[PDB]
């Protein structure tokens, strides 16, 4: 349910491909397979000691009287104390793109963003991003852009000007789940 809510909220409510294949495997039909699954998916904590501690609540035996309350309490305690459960229940974030400074320096906050070939199809295959000069640069007033120049014609402007920086604003992130959802919607709602 948590993974389905994460895949729903990654798009904004349809589902994302985030909840197609999660990090939990299916449980075997054996109590020994249950102990195997709890030891290999929540093995950073002692599961049996947590379930023994979560049995009583203010003297009341929850395990013999209120069964779904005890199951919810033990599941919450296991999900709290386990670090691997905390690392496997994370919300999908957008992809932070690198950026380089402008060639014609207009602002120190305006930067040329590094674009994934998933975002823009075609073009040449690129090298690694750091070699051209793309690093992590972001602040409170940072703006990211694609930088070209207006094409000079045979006219009065030849060399006195610095070939004015025609800009086109791009985003600071790549929401991969929303791109996959919109591509599947274009593969589905068009058909």
């Amino acid at each position: 349910q948590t993974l389905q809510n994460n895949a729903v909220e990654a798009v904004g409510a349809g589902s994302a491909p985030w909840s197609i294949l999660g990090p939990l495997t299916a449980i075997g039909p054996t109590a020994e397979d249950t102990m195997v699954w709890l030891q290999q998916h929540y093995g950073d904590v002692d599961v049996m000691s947590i379930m023994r501690w979560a049995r009583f609540r203010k003297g009341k035996d929850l395990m013999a009287k209120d069964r779904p309350q005890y199951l919810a309490r033990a599941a919450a305690w296991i999900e709290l104390l386990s670090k691997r459960n905390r690392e496997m229940e994370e919300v999908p974030l957008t992809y932070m793109r690198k950026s380089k400074p402008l060639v014609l320096d207009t602002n120190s906050n305006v930067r040329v963003a590094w674009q994934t070939p998933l975002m823009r199809s075609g073009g040449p295959p690129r090298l690694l991003a750091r070699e051209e000069g793309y690093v992590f640069h972001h602040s409170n007033s940072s703006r990211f852009v694609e930088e070209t120049y207006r094409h000079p014609g045979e006219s009065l402007q030849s060399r006195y000007l610095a070939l004015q920086p025609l800009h086109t604003e791009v985003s600071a992130k790549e929401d991969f789940q929303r791109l996959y959802y919109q591509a599947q919607k274009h593969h589905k709602q068009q058909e």
């Binding site: 985030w18 990090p23 994370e90 992809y95 932070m96 998933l118 972001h138 600071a172």
Partner: protein, 205 residues
Amino acid sequence: NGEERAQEAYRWFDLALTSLAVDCGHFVPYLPQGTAAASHITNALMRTLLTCGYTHVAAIPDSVYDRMGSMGISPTISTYELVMLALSLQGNMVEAESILSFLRSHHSEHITVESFNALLLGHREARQFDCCDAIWQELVDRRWPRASPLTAELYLRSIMDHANTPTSEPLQSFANINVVEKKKVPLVLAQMDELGVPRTHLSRV
């Protein structure tokens, strides 16, 4: 064996991606790269590559992050925290502060204390202790995410590293100057008594 465990982690990452492509056999051209399992395995790869030598630590935000972007895998908060910790161990603070500024701008409800620990460890390694004090004061101001004993460990070790630092502008004319920063220690400990950080959860040294 940093390089050998790094090669084994890369090989097991390739094995994992092959088995994820097998296990996913709509979203058909966007699998298994759009799933949670690919992001979890990439986070495990970054967490293992942090353990290895300096080459793989430097390759975590260089090669591994660009490969994760080119593959189309959506990252999580542990991805950015491990990239920040790799840049912290490299000593590059402007990129780590840029990543935390990106996280403050866009996904601010998901930030945990490991990013603050990454910045504390990195400004301790870059020997910019005023930034360590600024990060600790910000963490005391916001009070969320909660300060682990690793926060107090990194901040008090930055204080002890700055206090044992010799200076060269007075050329030790009378005494050592930085020892007065140890006077900050009875303050911050009291802040721990307000933060609920137990002082018995500190190392013996």
